[PDB]
Design a protein around this ligand. Structure first.
Ligand SMILES: [Zn+2]
Ligand SMILES: [Zn+2]
Lengths: 114, 147, 278, 209, 96, 97, 147, 48
């Protein structure tokens, strides 16, 4: 899912029903523009907050000298020994102590979770 | 950091901070920021060496002083919110060595841990053998001692 | 544990994994992959596809862990939703064997024969998640269950020999107070069930009950430190607070609503105003 | 649903029989103690479109001193009661020439109907009781001590013994749940007997105002 | 390694803190008991505590054995810096 | 009195605050009058009961002859009278004291 | 109520010398950015991140009734210190307020509206990050936050 | 300030400044709180 913008005028699309076809469309009340809406969802809501933070932690965090780093856990793709580890920051979850690992060598921006 | 340590176009009073997770870099030249000096640690070794101590011991009639020590890149001023990005070692002889490896990315070292006390609390003999309320009471009563 | 689950407030949001609003213009040609099976099972001999049925689909997922922790049934959830809103939603719901567990909700039948179609469906979702009240009593946040080790909340009975025997039985301690409906509840002990709220005990049991409960609360808060205070002072304080027939708080309001002399009142907390009124 | 609605009605009836017994009426021991199965057999189990309609449940009980003093208990079928319904009850009340009656309301009563109850007060006295309030007997709670309504002769003897004017006594308001339970009016005095850990027993008197 | 099971009515953080506090309190109590047992009959700390004039068994324990855990608003010392207590410690360090 | 005490004090807490210490008082009397526990006593068991009954009339908290005053007096001194009778039991006097 | 329940949280601004709250989109349009893409491009850097989009959406819908810069300026001026007698007087007063008392450290010359837009967008973005729980709330007793 | 006028009268009753009765006997037993001591009933606990 995501927002999309009208071709005529760089303003936000929002959904409507074509009651002549009985088929969905996007439209833009700033102008006279109609578009086919291929994404069958208009609104989704991840109530439980299911997410693991791999999509939010960055590889640049490997350069932080105040983070801890162990030789215990190797990276998958390269197998460099050094990997900095740190905790979760997401609040809505069943758990609060799991460690997120980032491979320490600057060429290997790989991140994984044990 | 190189330019600040060389005092070239950045005054040693300027603080620079990189917050890696939020991708921000903050530079403050503002007045009113509190800061304290610290020794720079490169790798596992202090940048303070025996020639600096020899020159400072011969400080008289040598016009070599704390400003010349600062200009050599040995000591650095660090304020409160730059300490957040600093890995400090309590003492060099104890925490730089290959003990069991707690940390290896130390970037700074304290001059002496007793420098955390104020003027009135610095007259207390053995303050670490006392209760903190009693240290506070002595700090308050020392201003009323006659002399 | 059955009483614990029957006493605790549970909204539909706690057991719901995620929600998505889909657009399905026709009942049978569904955009989801798995729903096709039970869709055909319900619509081959169609339940109320008699008037028109709306292009807009609401689709809630239920976490199995939370669903089975509270001994809920999807039939129960459908019954509760349908009864709470009436016929203005049509509820379509899974086989209990569906590995990912779905409750397909559409807007009213006859409305398909103002709030926009999707905007009301969003407003419905935002109402259900906070207000559906699946189980238990509201204003009850959490309920704790434990075996007490202190004799003042262990059940002590007299045996056949005349001795005092202390029994260990499970007791519940709630966060949030609704005393009346809990005293009504099946297998809860009406004689001994009590709360720490004073006004709640008042409006339910009357003034002598507040006298005794306030005495107990004061005794607890004074003797928790281990100190001892004579009973007479506690009794006098409670008697003065509950003497006029209602809860007289020891504040400017409570003290000055006594019919005493204005010179006594001006010497406590409202000096000039008391004399002005007098 | 219906087994638990049956359960609610049985608890309400048991609490009402205890109420009437505590107010000094002729209530037989069997009526005081009725098992759920016995009540179920008597009134025909499930209420919804079933034999215990709310109107099937009304109670007539006689006072011990005089059988001409009687209380009806009513169980209105409506979730909320109105002036029309209360006027029907008052019409039936006049047709029997009873003087006192109760009403057990399922949810609540409109203020215009509350006003109507008190408007009637010199003729016929009606008392509202919510369904939840009758789901448990508060008199049997551990915090509530024993309450005894005093007669006028006893109140006079009390005031002569302690040489007290009526307003000098501790007070209890008429909205007190125990005062509703015992049907106590303004000006009456209740006698409270509670145990004490210093004396052993202590008697307190509350004036109803 | 996510092997810790959460106690009923408690969060994972709450049960982790409870277990650590239990361990440290047991340690402090055992050390105090050993220190009290090591006292001689001539010891003036014991002579003052036993008679109840002044001082206590926890004062003797703190003087001789272990000062113990330090608490702020009834909780263990918080993280005034980003994910650490002092710049001398590493981030995410829950050790004693 | 035992039934009344079991009604008054659920949980069986026997520690009660009362005016005069009967055990200390009996112990004072034993030492004052040089009483030998090894020898038979000359105290007639009727006089114990009669003295307790007559003493209970002389401990007045509510003064009056009305039935209301009598009931108030009984309620005020119930616990202390129960304790007094328990301690001055005739068997207990003959065996222990 | 049904209208309120459908939409939830709205971002509003308390500008200096302005009576009450003002929606963010109205302020951004008053700064000269009519188009919703430009407004969201200044607010949200990540067009691929749906949680931010869902958070921002009600604010856009609240301020849809105002669609051009002069109308937004009149809307702001109507809530000024005093309602101006003439519409252009209110417009001029609002423009002066938005040039001088709004974010003076970012700039004061009429060129700097673009930089003001970026800074206000950063403020809103930080607020959204705090609302998503992606950043920690600032500590007021943090001694680096003090001068 | 709330309790300052509560007082034991010559009736042994406890009354406030308005002569309203707070307690019919002080402490519900009429005894001062300084002469009392802790004691054991010795009839409460025993087996039958
Ligand atoms: Zn457009
Ligand atoms: Zn790697």
């Amino acid at each position: 899912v995501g927002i999309r913008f009208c071709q005529e005028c760089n303003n936000m699309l929002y959904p409507k029903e074509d009651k002549e076809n009985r088929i969905l469309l996007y439209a833009c009340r700033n102008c006279d523009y109609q578009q086919e809406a291929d994404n069958s969802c208009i609104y989704v809501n991840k109530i439980t907050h299911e997410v693991d933070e791999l999509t939010q932690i960055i590889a640049d965090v490997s350069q932080d000298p105040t983070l801890p780093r162990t030789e215990d856990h190797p990276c998958q793709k390269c197998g460099h020994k050094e990997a900095v580890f740190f905790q979760s920051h997401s609040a809505r979850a069943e758990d609060a102590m799991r460690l997120y690992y980032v491979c320490t060598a600057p060429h290997c921006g790989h991140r994984w979770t044990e | 950091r190189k330019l600040r340590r060389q005092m070239d176009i950045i005054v040693s009073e300027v603080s620079m901070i990189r917050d890696i997770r939020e991708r921000e870099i903050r530079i403050y030249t503002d007045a009113g920021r509190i800061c304290r000096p610290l020794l720079i640690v490169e790798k596992q070794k202090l940048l303070l060496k025996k020639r600096h101590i020899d020159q400072l011991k011969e400080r008289e009639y040598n016009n070599y002083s704390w400003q010349d020590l600062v200009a050599s890149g040995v000591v650095e001023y660090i304020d409160t919110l730059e300490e957040e990005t600093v890995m400090l070692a309590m003492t060099p002889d104890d925490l730089q060595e290959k003990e069991v490896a707690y940390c290896s990315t130390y970037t700074h070292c304290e001059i002496h841990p007793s420098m955390i006390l104020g003027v009135c609390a610095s007259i207390i003999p053995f303050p670490d053998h006392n209760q903190s309320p009693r240290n506070t009471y002595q700090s308050a009563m020392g201003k009323q001692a006659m002399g | 544990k059955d009483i614990l689950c029957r006493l605790e407030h549970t909204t539909l949001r706690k057991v719901t994994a995620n929600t998505a609003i889909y657009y399905d213009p026709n009942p049978q040609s569904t955009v989801v992959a798995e729903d096709q099976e039970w869709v055909n099972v319900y619509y081959e001999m169609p339940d109320f596809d008699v008037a028109r049925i709306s292009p807009w689909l609401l689709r809630v997922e239920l976490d199995r862990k939370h669903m089975t922790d509270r001994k809920l049934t999807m039939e129960q959830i459908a019954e509760k939703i349908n009864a709470g809103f009436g016929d203005d939603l049509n509820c379509i719901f899974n086989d209990d064997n569906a590995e990912k567990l779905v409750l397909r909700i559409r807007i009213m039948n006859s409305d398909e024969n103002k709030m926009d179609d999707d905007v009301f469906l969003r407003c419905i979702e935002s109402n259900m998640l906070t207000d559906m009240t699946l189980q238990g009593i509201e204003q009850i946040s959490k309920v704790y269950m434990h075996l007490p080790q202190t004799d003042n909340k262990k059940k002590i009975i007299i045996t056949e020999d005349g001795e005092f025997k202390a029994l260990q039985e499970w007791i519940l301690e709630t966060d949030g107070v609704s005393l009346m409906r809990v005293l009504s509840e099946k297998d809860v002990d009406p004689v001994r069930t009590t709360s720490n709220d004073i006004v709640e005990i008042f409006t339910v049991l009357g003034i002598e009950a507040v006298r005794k409960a306030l005495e107990r609360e004061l005794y607890h808060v004074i003797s928790f430190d281990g100190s001892y205070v004579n009973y007479r002072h506690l009794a006098l304080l409670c008697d003065t607070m509950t003497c006029r027939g209602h809860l007289m708080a020891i504040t400017r309001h409570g003290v000055n609503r006594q019919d005493t002399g204005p010179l006594m009142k001006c010497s406590f907390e409202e000096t000039v105003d008391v004399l002005m009124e007098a | 649903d219906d087994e638990e609605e049956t359960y609610r009605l049985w608890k309400i009836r048991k609490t009402i029989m205890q109420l009437c017994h505590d107010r000094g009426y002729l209530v037989t021991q069997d009526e005081l103690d009725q098992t759920l199965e016995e009540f179920k057999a008597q009134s025909g189990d499930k209420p919804s479109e079933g034999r215990p309609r709310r109107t099937d449940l009304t109670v007539l009980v006689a006072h011990n001193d005089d059988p001409t003093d009687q209380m009806f208990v009513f169980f209105p079928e409506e979730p909320k009661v109105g002036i029309k319904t209360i006027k029907v009850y008052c019409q039936r009340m006049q047709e029997e020439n009873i003087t006192r009656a109760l009403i057990v309301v399922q949810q609540g009563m409109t203020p215009s109907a509350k006003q109507s109850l008190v408007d009637m007060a010199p003729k016929y006295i009606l008392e509202q009781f919510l369904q939840q309030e009758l789901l448990i007997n508060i008199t049997e709670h551990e915090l509530v001590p024993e309450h005894v309504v005093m007669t006028k002769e006893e109140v006079t003897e009390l005031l002569a013994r302690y040489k007290l004017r009526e307003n000098q006594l501790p007070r209890i308001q008429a909205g007190d749940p125990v005062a509703r339970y015992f049907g106590i009016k303004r000006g009456q005095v209740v006698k409270i007997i509670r145990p004490s850990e210093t004396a052993g027993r202590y008697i307190t008197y509350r004036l109803v105002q | 390694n996510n092997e810790l099971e959460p106690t009923p009515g408690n969060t994972l953080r709450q049960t982790f803190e409870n277990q650590v506090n239990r361990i440290l309190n047991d340690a402090r109590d055992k050390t105090g008991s050993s220190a009290q047992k090591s006292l001689s009959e001539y010891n003036n700390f014991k002579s003052m505590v036993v008679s109840g004039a002044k001082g206590s068994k926890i004062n003797i324990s703190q003087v001789i054995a272990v000062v113990g855990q330090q608490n702020v608003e009834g909780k263990r010392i918080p993280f005034g810096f980003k994910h650490r207590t002092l710049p001398h410690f590493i981030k995410d360090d829950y050790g004693p | 009195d035992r039934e009344v005490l079991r009604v008054i004090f659920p949980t069986g807490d026997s520690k009660v605050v009362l005016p005069c210490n009967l055990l200390r008082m009996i112990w004072n009397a034993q030492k004052i009058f040089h009483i030998n526990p090894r020898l038979p006593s000359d105290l007639h068991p009727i006089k114990v009961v009669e003295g307790v009954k007559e003493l209970s009339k002389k401990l007045v908290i509510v003064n009056g002859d009305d039935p209301l005053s009598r009931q108030a007096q009984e309620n005020a001194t119930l616990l202390f009278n129960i304790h007094l009778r328990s301690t001055l039991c005739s068997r207990r006097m003959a065996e222990e004291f | 109520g049904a209208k309120k329940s459908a939409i939830g949280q709205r971002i509003v601004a308390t500008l200096p010398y302005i009576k009450q709250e003002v929606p963010i989109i109205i302020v951004f349009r008053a700064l000269g950015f009519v188009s919703d893409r430009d407004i969201l491009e200044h607010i949200i850097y990540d067009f691929e991140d749906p949680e931010m989009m869902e958070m921002v959406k009600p604010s856009l819908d609240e301020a849809f009734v105002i669609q051009e810069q002069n109308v937004a300026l009149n809307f702001i001026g109507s809530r000024g210190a005093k309602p101006g007698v003439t519409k252009e007087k209110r417009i001029k007063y609002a423009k002066e307020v938005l040039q001088k008392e709004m974010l003076p450290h970012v700039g004061v010359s009429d060129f700097c509206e673009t930089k003001k837009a970026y800074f206000l967008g950063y403020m809103v973005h930080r607020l959204l990050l705090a609302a998503l729980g992606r950043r920690e709330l600032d500590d007021r007793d943090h001694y680096g936050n003090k001068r | 300030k709330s309790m300052e006028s509560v007082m034991v009268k010559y009736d042994a009753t406890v009354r406030n400044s308005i002569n309203q009765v707070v307690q019919l006997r002080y402490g519900e037993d009429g005894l001062a709180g300084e002469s009392v001591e802790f004691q054991n009933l010795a009839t409460l606990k025993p087996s039958n």
